[PDB]
Amino acid sequence: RTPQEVLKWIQDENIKIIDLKFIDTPGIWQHCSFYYDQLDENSFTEGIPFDGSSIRGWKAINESDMCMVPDPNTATIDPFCKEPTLSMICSIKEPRTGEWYNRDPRTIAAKAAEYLRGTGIADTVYFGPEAEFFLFDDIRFGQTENSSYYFADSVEGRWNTGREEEGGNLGYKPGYKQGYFPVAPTDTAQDIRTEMLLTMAAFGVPIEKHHHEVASGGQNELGIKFDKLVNSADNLMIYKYVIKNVAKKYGKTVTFMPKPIFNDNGSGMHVHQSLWKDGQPLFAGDKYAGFSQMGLWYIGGILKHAPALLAFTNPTTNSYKRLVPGFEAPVNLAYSQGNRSASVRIPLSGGNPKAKRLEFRCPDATSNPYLAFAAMLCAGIDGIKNQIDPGEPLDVDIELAKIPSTPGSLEAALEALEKDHEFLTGTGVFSPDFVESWIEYKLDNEVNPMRLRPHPYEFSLYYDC
Amino acid sequence: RTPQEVLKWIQDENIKIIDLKFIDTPGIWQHCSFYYDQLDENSFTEGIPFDGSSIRGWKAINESDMCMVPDPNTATIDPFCKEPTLSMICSIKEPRTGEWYNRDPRTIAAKAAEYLRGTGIADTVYFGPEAEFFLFDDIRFGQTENSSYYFADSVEGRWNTGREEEGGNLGYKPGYKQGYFPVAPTDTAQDIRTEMLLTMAAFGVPIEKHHHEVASGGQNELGIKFDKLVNSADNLMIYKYVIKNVAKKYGKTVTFMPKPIFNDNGSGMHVHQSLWKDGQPLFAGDKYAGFSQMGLWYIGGILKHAPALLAFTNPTTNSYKRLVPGFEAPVNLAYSQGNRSASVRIPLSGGNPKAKRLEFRCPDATSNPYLAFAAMLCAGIDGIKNQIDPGEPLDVDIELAKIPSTPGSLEAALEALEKDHEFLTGTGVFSPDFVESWIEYKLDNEVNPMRLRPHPYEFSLYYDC
């Protein structure tokens, strides 16, 4: 689609409102709605003004003015608007320079794909994210000077087997770790997952499947096809938007947080990736697990830069409650085929070169997909260019100190980024300015506020002392 | 039906979602939904991937990847999906070998029918299961360190004759043991049972009848026609699925547990069986109760291997609360005609050779029908091949030590399986690997957790001591 085709669309269908969407630095979709007459040919080049100082991690009040540039290829009707509204995904333009903004995650993402094409290694990188979530019926949290609390609830919750329910308690509550994937009446989310899957398809997302996940009390997963870097990060943002909004439609609440439930499965975002040139898969070969030496080298980079990569792929203190040794892994920095306990997994493809890829299991859905994907690409490329030996595969379950480990906290991942960021910066994709502001925002707004707050389990262990 | 006919069905009717169903080792139906484009000709041979390590009693995390192979003959529309969804029953393929998985109960089931055809004794085995259930209006259970509780409820419950009900208490609550089979207003489940019966018919199940059962407080039964081994175990899984899901539709809850109610009828799954060759009934003859010597020998095997058979036909600790001497039997290992107190019953057929069969009364609906049916077939065949004399019929009600008895607990049935499993393994149907993992899963997840937990009746007997 083109700027003129989108403008013809608005005229023919008499669309009165345009909803322009764009991501912020941490990873939250922002929006502004406009009356149809506000969008012209120039909106697709010069962009539409807004305050860049109210968006987290961007401009300072003194240099506030920024521009929203919508992508015509993203235009669809937002089903969640009573009034027929056309929705587009934007990239951010600096009005002072007229160039794309260096802190815009969607700009960084495009720059990463431009860099890949520049090296001659490949022309396309396919990303296939797998974002698990929880479908909750209630959420109550807070923390005052004399209190700290959270209470998550779901009808599927095993903690609710003995409770009085309105007309009445119908049983079939999945047991802890026992939600993957018994039929209804255990699975209460079939109709909703199909709706979430079908509505995002109409948004332009390539859809595949859906299933109930391991955890009791609403853990679910929707399966979407891979796509090119920017397109894939655009697809994850839509994915997250429709799921949250269909949940709200049916009076429910969704969270993509890694560990909302203690002693049950966390929500991870396993990300499948492969490099391609002239339509041919470059990760197909005759080496380990039917991979090519390039594919082994891409894993090399991923595994070597994994601690730094975690500052972008697992950017929350909560990420580290899931990335704990034992439950359920991937804490250990190694590759393997079929092994779902290893950081990098080589799925078993049915002898098809087109299906040959690596699954980086460490990431979770709290990440900015534009930043996470660009970072993983950079580590991958550096791995082929340096030409990082991933070591030997580990084809076992659960001496364990011989294998390098992932950071155990957010500050540790931020430390690993300060030490190892040349594979990102030296490229031009991420600016040293952005990498520094990322560490600073995460330390001041997440690491430090958390260190200050008493944890309720500290009463369980320490009230008597 | 064929893979192409199913694919033509999806194209012509514009079916967007495909629901693939498969059983786990203990006996719970699992599922995964796919967008239409994910199912092609190759899905019917190579299968569709999934995690075999999250399914109870299967693969270990290190060797996780498995394949779902749908059966085209099982395709129907799942009525419980708002969105028109096509549903198929799968068998599990090992992607490493390309062969059918040895722990897949549906594979074991097919292997059992392949074995029967291999012996030349018969070409077909007809199984007619009779699974009673309870239709409850409420269920609350739990067990903490300082508590253990369950509270089952139904409007039909005799325990509710003196309670205040919303506008108001309409009486006609069946008395204990007095539910078989007074008319409405006593029987409150006529409309629902007809719906359960008619919807499963549309799923491809051969339907016969329905009635209210002996127990007060929702005991019911739906009658379905016999079918070939795999088809019959497929029919029982559908049977259980529609009943549970129509109950959920009308805000009610179903249990197939053997003994949910104390001092009232348990839920048993009487299983009628007969061998056939070239369309002719092989259990018709001029011996006892109009049976053939082969039929007498098949009973021989069943009765001889019955204690081991119970590790598969009655695989729960709760099974043994129903299989108690007195209420209501069949605890005594003997055959008889018309006698509903004997383990094996020869029903009175109207002088029709086609209706000549044995009714093994011991089983209950907690069993995996694929495992239970394959096991009973194996014991039957071994009985004809060895050529086990069933002894003499016992045509009496209620010296009693002269007759061999069934195990009194789950561990006892598991003990009997360790001692007597050659009739299963030596065949090739069940692998010694599967038989060992079955005992281990049942001991670690059911027998041992139960031995640890205080029973509320232990307070009734022992609080003062």
Place this chain on the structure above:
Amino acid sequence: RTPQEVLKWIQDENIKIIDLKFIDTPGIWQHCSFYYDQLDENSFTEGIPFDGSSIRGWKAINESDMCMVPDPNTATIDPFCKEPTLSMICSIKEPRTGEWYNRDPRTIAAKAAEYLRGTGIADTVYFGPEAEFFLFDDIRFGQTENSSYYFADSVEGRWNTGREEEGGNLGYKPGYKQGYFPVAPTDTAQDIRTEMLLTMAAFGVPIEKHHHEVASGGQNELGIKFDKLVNSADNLMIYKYVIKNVAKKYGKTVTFMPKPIFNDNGSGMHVHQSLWKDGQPLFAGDKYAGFSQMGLWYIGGILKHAPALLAFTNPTTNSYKRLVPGFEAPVNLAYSQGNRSASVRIPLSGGNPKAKRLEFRCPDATSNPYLAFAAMLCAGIDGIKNQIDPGEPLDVDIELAKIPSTPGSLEAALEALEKDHEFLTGTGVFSPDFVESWIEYKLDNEVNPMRLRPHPYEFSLYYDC
């Protein structure tokens, strides 16, 4: 007092019950009561048996049997027993060897004082602990799979200024950080603090003063005089016992946890210390702040070994919520006079050599005083023996990276103990066995369980992502 004088006491006053008290490894007082006839002359040498395998961090089930040896000098009447009960503090004897148990904190403490006397540096070490606490009216905490919560309450709590109270809300609730030290009706704890002070005096504790502390909602402090190492750690255990028990008497609850309240003062245990020989103060001199070179060197050791010392003086994850840069310090490893923002403070003595001492401000009341005091003594001695220059004093409020900092977590303090423990072990005071079991107990029972549990503030930051 002697074993015979204690036995004469029991006979003359007709005391029927004897309460023998002893500390466990983490720092909790344990007890066992005996009928008078059970205590004879041999109880004061051979000791009284008990199970050393049920006490945290001690014997294994196979080598369980241990002995309690009471100290006659600790005998007093426990006021909290309706029946006149004589109470004594014990040390633990190994019955296998007949020697004092190497994991007994009270034995380690005596060994530390024996070591000081062995070096010829001094004959006496005086410890003056200052343990702040909170006096709460209510405490509710818990953490399930779907929840985590704590709710602390007090009538003094500023969070309660707008609440309906029984007949009625009388105001005068101290403001946050504004509790030190307005008069009544603001201070509601005058009578109780006097009772806590007077009852511990009758227990044999040298008492000095009492005041309301900085924090709103019940923060209090009782002032006690210094004493010799073991005597001082005995005095802190009594201090903690009477405060908790007088609170219980008046239907209230006390906590010595470092940070129960967010955004208000933590509970610290500032510990004043000085070495003496032949009745003369050795920390009096003509150097900085009227100190001696020995005193400067003792600070040297303290400051150098402070990160390792924190594994014993601040042994909880909660300790690190108080030891946070800013609120209120001492995070910075430096000495100064009058400065209450420095780790080590030299209080202003009124030109009296007898009052010349250092105040290590880092410790909190979650510590085992026997372990904390022995550790600080060892670091002090090593400082004089090596002859560690403490650096130059920092006489400022709040470049800041030039000054060495304390660990930011419990694992970090445990890391610092593994690297620096020779000043403890090489001495003989702490065994390498004890130092290893300490790290292991803290990692397995506190550090690792905490890393697993979602924090409620993680919902505040991450629910939307």
